[PDB]
Design an enzyme around this catalytic site. Structure first.
Site, PDB file in Angstrom:
ATOM      1  N   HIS B 168      80.203 -59.725 106.404  1.00 25.86           N
ATOM      2  CA  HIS B 168      79.983 -58.998 105.162  1.00 25.86           C
ATOM      3  C   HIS B 168      78.773 -58.066 105.274  1.00 25.86           C
ATOM      4  CE1 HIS B 168      79.591 -58.067 100.941  1.00 25.86           C
ATOM      5  NE2 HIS B 168      78.349 -58.511 100.975  1.00 25.86           N
TER       6      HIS B 168
HETATM    7  C1  HEM Z   1      71.477 -58.899 103.765  1.00 27.87           C
HETATM    8  C2  HEM Z   1      72.752 -59.216 103.537  1.00 27.87           C
HETATM    9  C3  HEM Z   1      73.726 -58.518 102.542  1.00 27.87           C
HETATM   10  C4  HEM Z   1      73.959 -57.206 102.373  1.00 27.87           C
HETATM   11  C5  HEM Z   1      73.353 -55.978 103.090  1.00 27.87           C
HETATM   12  C6  HEM Z   1      74.960 -57.073 101.330  1.00 27.87           C
HETATM   13  C7  HEM Z   1      75.443 -55.869 100.872  1.00 27.87           C
HETATM   14  C8  HEM Z   1      76.402 -55.727  99.914  1.00 27.87           C
HETATM   15  C9  HEM Z   1      76.894 -54.436  99.420  1.00 27.87           C
HETATM   16  C10 HEM Z   1      76.354 -53.075  99.950  1.00 27.87           C
HETATM   17  C11 HEM Z   1      77.836 -54.723  98.493  1.00 27.87           C
HETATM   18  C12 HEM Z   1      78.703 -53.774  97.632  1.00 27.87           C
HETATM   19  C13 HEM Z   1      79.607 -52.816  98.445  1.00 27.87           C
HETATM   20  C14 HEM Z   1      80.405 -51.882  97.555  1.00 27.87           C
HETATM   21  O1  HEM Z   1      79.754 -51.330  96.610  1.00 27.87           O
HETATM   22  O2  HEM Z   1      81.641 -51.764  97.817  1.00 27.87           O
HETATM   23  C15 HEM Z   1      77.941 -56.161  98.381  1.00 27.87           C
HETATM   24  C16 HEM Z   1      78.782 -56.841  97.525  1.00 27.87           C
HETATM   25  C17 HEM Z   1      78.881 -58.215  97.395  1.00 27.87           C
HETATM   26  N1  HEM Z   1      78.115 -59.138  98.080  1.00 27.87           N
HETATM   27 FE1  HEM Z   1      76.746 -58.710  99.472  1.00 27.87          FE
HETATM   28  N2  HEM Z   1      75.335 -58.314 100.863  1.00 27.87           N
HETATM   29  C18 HEM Z   1      74.581 -59.230 101.584  1.00 27.87           C
HETATM   30  C19 HEM Z   1      74.645 -60.598 101.411  1.00 27.87           C
HETATM   31  C20 HEM Z   1      75.469 -61.301 100.540  1.00 27.87           C
HETATM   32  C21 HEM Z   1      75.501 -62.753 100.380  1.00 27.87           C
HETATM   33  C22 HEM Z   1      74.562 -63.704 101.196  1.00 27.87           C
HETATM   34  C23 HEM Z   1      76.447 -63.044  99.445  1.00 27.87           C
HETATM   35  C24 HEM Z   1      76.947 -64.408  98.843  1.00 27.87           C
HETATM   36  C25 HEM Z   1      77.024 -65.530  99.621  1.00 27.87           C
HETATM   37  C26 HEM Z   1      77.005 -61.756  99.009  1.00 27.87           C
HETATM   38  C27 HEM Z   1      78.004 -61.599  98.050  1.00 27.87           C
HETATM   39  C28 HEM Z   1      78.523 -60.383  97.627  1.00 27.87           C
HETATM   40  C29 HEM Z   1      79.582 -60.232  96.627  1.00 27.87           C
HETATM   41  C30 HEM Z   1      80.303 -61.388  95.886  1.00 27.87           C
HETATM   42  C31 HEM Z   1      79.794 -58.919  96.489  1.00 27.87           C
HETATM   43  C32 HEM Z   1      80.831 -58.201  95.565  1.00 27.87           C
HETATM   44  C33 HEM Z   1      82.105 -57.816  96.391  1.00 27.87           C
HETATM   45  C34 HEM Z   1      83.463 -57.783  95.694  1.00 27.87           C
HETATM   46  O3  HEM Z   1      83.422 -57.847  94.420  1.00 27.87           O
HETATM   47  O4  HEM Z   1      84.481 -57.695  96.459  1.00 27.87           O
HETATM   48  N3  HEM Z   1      76.392 -60.704  99.686  1.00 27.87           N
HETATM   49  N4  HEM Z   1      77.038 -56.762  99.240  1.00 27.87           N
END
Ligand code: HEM
Ligand SMILES: CCCCCCCCCCCCCCCCCC(=O)OC[C@H](COP(=O)([O-])OCC(O)COP(=O)([O-])OC[C@@H](COC(=O)CCCCCCCCCCCCCCCCC)OC(=O)CCCCCCCCCCCCCCCCC)OC(=O)CCCCCCCCCCCCCCCCC
Ligand SMILES: CCCCCCCCCCCCCCCCCC(=O)OC[C@H](COP(=O)([O-])OCC(O)COP(=O)([O-])OC[C@@H](COC(=O)CCCCCCCCCCCCCCCCC)OC(=O)CCCCCCCCCCCCCCCCC)OC(=O)CCCCCCCCCCCCCCCCC
Ligand code: HEM
Ligand code: SF4
Ligand code: SF4
Ligand code: SF4
Ligand code: SF4
Ligand code: SF4
Ligand code: SF4
Ligand code: SF4
Ligand code: SF4
Lengths: 289, 216, 289
Positions: B168
């Protein structure tokens, strides 16, 4: 470390992760020094150094019987002499000085190195040298000015209450050696009993203020005294009256820590949520629309 | 279409997300330290090994609470539909950076949706098995056999979730412009057109239309 | 740690970096508890606590002689009583319970903290508390439900087979104290001999299924029993029939680890080689030409 599984206090250890102490059903021990029976022979200094394999330097005489002049890394106990007429006639008050093995030790409270100072279930407070970093915080934390740094290894040392003898069933070296029996040893409960019996005898001889020195300010000590003049402990070469851990040290090692912790956490949160909430401050946030 | 950026994520969901990430770093690393004891350095994730044992589950609970807030705010945008098939069939083409050519991508793509449910299912599994193996508070109420299965499953679930997050993060780093949107909240219209066509088309219409509805 | 240089197993230690064990030419020892000679006096509980400097709470009577009702951080061995008529007449089966000192210990196998649990060349399995983090994994890993957490220090404790006595040549405290000689101690080789002699005598008295309890599923134990009814160990207050390390624990602590390791390494490789191979996915890779 912790092989004896009876460590009730340990320096620089968080309160929610206490040291191994399941084997804590042991009677507390204590040394009782009756200064009214002390003849200032210094046998205790000699027996201590002989048993502990340490030798201080050959010093100088500067006008008094006291020698060495102070506790040091190589002298774990010293006799302190005081001549006075404060009570109506000439008196020579002689007191054995060294670690008091406090129930609530200021040295341990001030120490910043995990496991450098520990307290056993029986009351002995000891230094675990492998963990000592030589900062000297314990010297200031001690209400009795006891810890001493060894220049040759940057670590502090002091009376161990002959933990190596007591741990296997034998009384300390100084206790055994005392020519007049001024020094007694046993369970603290029975030493307190002997102390009160002695105080009663001193009162019967005219010392109306004779008493036991077992300071409540540090939770009681495992090295106690019977004093002819318990109302004036300073007469015995500066023994503190009502000693306690200093207020500045208690605050420094106490509330200051969690307060600082909250500030740090809160600051990090604020800054992080701030950056995210408002966004960067670049040259033009305006021509971005 | 006359603005450098369009809002993709609200502040509240950005704050939550980065709170989860920080908590996850601590929980994942402490968990790994129990899983691979040879990696001794990780036993100091929470200061000392003794402290890490205590705190891991508490921060774990916090992650679950926060992920449930995320669940109710993002689930409706992560629902699988027939339009997701095209994605699933040209995965190899999507990984080469050619997804637009091969799929219909709305708010979040089919990969993001699979990740979302994987992440949400694993945190539920970790919550349940975690509580079961939690000493001194809860493990006592469970039959030893249940505790044993829970120890096996929790370890497995934890590892699966960490792999998932690695992927991710990578993707986030890979589809450039993405991290800024999660930190600042805005995405450039071109980023929307390339990676999420259908989605921006919808904002664009919602936009223009309701402003055309006003009666300029 | 490792001062004795005879550590044959150590918790959470990679198989290619084994613990110090050059001094391993020592006979294995063992305690043999002949339940057919036990009178349920509880002398063993008392001697154990006295020797080990531990005291449990004063509990309650809830209808049975058993007390304390279970092993705890302060009770390293307890007598378990069972009344039954399963064999044709009333029998009172009494069994001393506590660590079995397994040849292949499940506690050690499940433990995630390096050095928290060790196994000596002579067969004693012991807890090195300085390394215990209080996770409790050992409680589930143990086929006999033996480890117990001390709420006062977050560490587990159990029967040490009086390692502090055995290490210097003396038998355990409970062994020595047993009024009827139900408990025996010596080298495992000769204890097995005594066990078989006893089984022969029990068979001669009509106990056709008398036998030695030394479970092969855990590689044999260093605390064994002679049972009148070895075909029904559950009769003795739940003693397991054919105990072994649980399959889920073996998989969790076994194959799952290297599998996960391969996935991690392979994933990192894939992602890294992927980024490099294809390059970033930016807004326009096309107007770059
Ligand atoms: C440093 C590490 C991480 C980065 C750089 C990151 C980055 C991102 C980004 C850029 C998005 C949105 C992308 C878009 O707008 O399409 C996103 C969405 C999300 N992230 Fe992360 N994330 C990280 C870690 C995590 C962790 C540890 C979790 C939970 C265990 C998590 C859960 C989510 C969820 C649930 C979404 C929404 C996606 C959806 O609704 O399909 N993220 N993250
Ligand atoms: C919103 C406001 C939030 C407020 C929360 C306040 C919490 C206070 C907790 C505590 O102090 O109670 C202590 C409580 C009582 O302990 P105590 O025995 O009475 O005394 C403490 C010790 O005497 C002496 O103190 P201590 O050593 O035990 O301090 C405790 C704590 C200590 O940690 C902290 O207090 C906060 C950490 C601050 C680090 C500062 C970094 C600054 C350096 C930067 C320099 C940069 C250079 C530029 C060039 O360490 C552990 O508990 C684990 C915390 C791990 C944080 C890991 C962060 C990594 C993120 C990276 C991504 O201990 C605990 O219950 C567990 C605390 C868990 C907190 C979560
Ligand atoms: C292409 C596919 C390649 C496949 C290779 C498979 C290798 C499996 C090796 C092994 O498990 O055999 C184990 C073998 C058998 O051990 P065993 O006693 O039967 O059981 C292992 C222990 O029970 C329990 O397991 P363990 O604790 O002993 O695990 C072993 C290994 C453990 O390390 C690993 O298995 C891989 C490391 C994975 C770390 C995961 C990081 C994830 C966290 C991220 C969270 C981010 C948060 C987002 C916010 O630790 C050491 O051997 C040194 C490896 C150091 C890697 C350093 C990387 C730093 C790079 C930075 C730039 O141990 C070894 O022979 C030396 C292995 C050397 C591998 C090279
Ligand atoms: C949902 C809330 C969670 C709870 C209540 C929880 C609780 C626990 C507990 C009680 C343990 C045993 C050690 C200890 O007491 O510290 C443990 C181990 C572990 N947890 Fe969690 N946890 C949670 C979430 C997570 C998450 C989100 C991950 C993945 C990042 C994770 C990964 C691990 C790992 C890898 C282990 C060690 C298993 C082993 O030794 O092989 N946990 N957890
Ligand atoms: S050995 Fe006894 S009598 Fe002699 S100086 Fe020391 S305490 Fe006093
Ligand atoms: S006398 Fe000083 S060195 Fe001795 S135990 Fe008390 S505070 Fe520590
Ligand atoms: S000098 Fe004193 S305070 Fe400093 S680490 Fe050593 S024992 Fe602790
Ligand atoms: S008790 Fe032992 S260490 Fe302390 S002064 Fe006496 S002889 Fe020295
Ligand atoms: S001391 Fe011996 S006879 Fe008494 S209850 Fe224990 S094993 Fe049985
Ligand atoms: S009986 Fe349990 S605690 Fe004892 S050695 Fe065996 S597995 Fe470990
Ligand atoms: S509780 Fe058990 S499994 Fe956990 S570290 Fe301590 S001995 Fe190991
Ligand atoms: S062998 Fe020692 S530790 Fe074990 S039950 Fe007997 S007396 Fe207690």
């Amino acid at each position: 470390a912790m092989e004896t599984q009876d460590i009730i206090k340990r320096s620089a250890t968080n309160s929610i992760t206490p040291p191994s102490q399941v084997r804590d059903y042991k009677a507390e021990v204590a040394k009782l020094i009756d200064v009214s029976t002390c003849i200032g022979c210094k046998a205790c200094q000699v027996a201590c150094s002989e048993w502990n394999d340490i030798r201080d330097e050959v010093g100088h005489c500067v006008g008094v019987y006291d020698n060495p002049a102070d506790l040091s890394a190589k002298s774990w106990t010293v006799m302190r002499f005081s001549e006075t007429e404060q009570n109506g006639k000439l008196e020579w008050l002689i007191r054995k000085d060294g670690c008091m093995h406090c129930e609530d030790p200021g040295c341990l409270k001030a120490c910043p190195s995990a496991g450098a100072i520990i307290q056993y279930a029986n009351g002995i407070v000891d230094f675990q040298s492998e963990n000592c970093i030589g900062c000297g915080y314990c010297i200031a934390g001690c209400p009795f000015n006891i810890p001493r740094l060894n220049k040759e290894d940057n670590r502090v040392y002091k009376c161990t209450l002959c933990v190596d003898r007591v741990s296997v069933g034998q009384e300390p070296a100084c206790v055994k050696t005392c020519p007049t029996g001024a020094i007694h040893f046993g369970t603290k409960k029975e030493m307190l009993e002997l102390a009160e019996q002695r105080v009663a005898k001193l009162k019967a001889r005219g010392y109306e203020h004779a008493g036991v020195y077992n300071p409540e300010g540090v939770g009681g000590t495992h090295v106690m005294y019977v004093l002819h003049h318990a109302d004036q402990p300073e007469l015995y070469h500066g023994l503190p009256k009502d000693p306690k851990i200093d207020t500045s040290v208690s605050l420094w090692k106490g509330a200051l820590k969690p307060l600082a912790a909250a500030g740090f956490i809160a600051t990090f949160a604020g800054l992080i949520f701030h950056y995210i909430g408002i966004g960067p401050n670049k040259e033009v946030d305006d021509d971005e629309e | 279409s006359k603005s450098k950026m369009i809002v993709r994520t609200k502040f509240i969901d950005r704050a939550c997300h980065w709170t989860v990430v920080i908590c996850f770093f601590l929980v994942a690393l402490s968990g790994i330290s129990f899983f691979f004891p040879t990696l001794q350095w990780l036993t100091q994730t929470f200061g000392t090994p003794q402290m890490g044992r205590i705190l891991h589950p508490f921060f774990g609970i916090a992650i679950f609470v926060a992920l449930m807030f995320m669940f109710v705010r993002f689930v409706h945008h992560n629902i699988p539909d027939k339009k997701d098939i095209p994605w699933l069939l040209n995965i190899v083409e999507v990984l080469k950076g050619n997804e637009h050519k091969v799929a219909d991508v709305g708010k979040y793509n089919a990969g993001q949706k699979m990740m979302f449910w994987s992440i949400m299912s694993m945190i539920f599994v970790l919550l349940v098995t975690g509580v079961i193996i939690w000493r001194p508070y809860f493990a006592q109420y469970f039959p030893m056999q249940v505790v044993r299965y829970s120890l096996l499953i929790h370890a497995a679930a934890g590892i699966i979730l960490i792999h998932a997050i690695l992927i991710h993060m990578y993707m986030a780093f890979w589809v450039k412009g993405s991290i800024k949107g999660m930190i600042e909240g805005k995405v450039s219209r071109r980023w929307a057109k390339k990676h999420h066509p259908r989605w921006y088309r919808e904002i664009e219409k919602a936009e223009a239309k309701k402003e055309s509805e006003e009666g300029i």
